[PDB]
Assembly symmetry: D2
Homo-oligomer: 116 residues x 4
């Protein structure tokens, strides 16, 4: 599992469950070719997005549908979504966890990169 | 100013100076039109991007060039940029501060909104 | 002002108004002496806590009463308070902004330091 | 495992390894009785701090030795430590994860509470 996305809820103090996540890879014409997508689990985690051989170097975009998450909870959100754009495996492939901590008017995102 | 952008550096504990910022607005045909741009000052703040007349209802995108900021300090950061996308003035005119707190592998963003 | 405290609300996207703040300084016998206190203004800012003469080298503690803030909005938050402890003026006098961004189950804090 | 502490590094984009963590429970005289302690693993996590029967309702303090972590990496830090103070199991015991995302001049902390 070379790429995982984890989403947390700072209002409830819980994983953010059933959050839609879309991943894209930058094409040669600099438009976003869809790559993988899913919804976060009961633990706020989305596994199995890609494979070691498919996850080559390049620029990737992770789009987290924060607006729908807050709307489903009946809370007014600020952002249309939370986008995270990064370059992958530029010094070799590792395991990437892209985490996001969500509030209605603010979010925090980090990368936690480890080696197996 | 109806729209201000403020950028801080969590590694040095200081304003993030000379950070390029580009603002776009979503057009009726769903494309991103360039709206305003500038660089943060010595205080980390970017003022004067727009006017109350020009800053109509719409969906706006603030793109903060975090990568060039870190590269100039010798750091290869994780993110290509930090993008903040939001609906503005849905309930009438407001003043928006878009703040970002930067680390090489993480950032936080928040909105501070006041009613003039 | 050599020491300013700023508190923001990540749920409403606004300054956190009327937040009580207590400052302490570590004495030679390792106890915490009350140094200054106040409440955040309409802008979320607390100015006027100390003077350049009084704000000598030392270890300072800023205690932000986040619990009363959330309780007054009907929310039972996770944290009892947010405490920020730091050495000040180790390399000569500086101006410190201590910022906190509040959610019911999470907070972020940062220091913005400038040289007068 | 009713209580876990997880510490991340926003500069390196990695778990924060070998970070000292001390937990205390508030006594009746309002001083901090030590409760449990440990060091974070290769994954940034500290497990096994207490048991279901020992982790009763009360106010707990988690002290994360952020200063030593940054010093060992040769990086100037702002804070003396990161303290998280909270009330536990006030509506029944769950599983508490206390997470902290560290930068030299800033940190973010959240609670992720789940039920088994
Ligand atoms: O967004 C923040 C912010 C972000 C965080 O992750 C943590 C935190 F304590 C504050 C911010 C906004 C502002 O308008 C502002 O002036 C400042 N400041 O002065 O330092 C900060
Ligand atoms: O990135 C974070 C994170 C972000 C913040 O703004 C503040 C903070 F304390 C942690 C994170 C990453 C993980 O992999 C993870 O498991 C968790 N967790 O379970 O709690 C959190």
């Amino acid at each position: 599992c070379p790429l995982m996305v984890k989403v947390l809820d700072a209002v409830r103090g819980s994983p953010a469950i059933n959050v839609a996540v879309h991943v894209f890879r930058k094409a040669a014409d600099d438009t976003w070719e869809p790559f993988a997508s899913g919804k976060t689990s009961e633990s706020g985690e989305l596994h199995g997005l890609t494979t070691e051989e498919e996850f080559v170097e390049g620029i990737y975009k992770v789009e987290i549908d924060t607006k729908s998450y807050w709307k489903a909870l009946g809370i007014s959100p600020f952002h249309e979504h939370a986008e995270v754009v990064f370059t992958a495996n530029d010094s070799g492939p590792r395991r990437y966890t892209i985490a996001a901590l969500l509030s209605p008017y603010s979010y925090s995102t980090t990368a936690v990169i480890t080696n197996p």
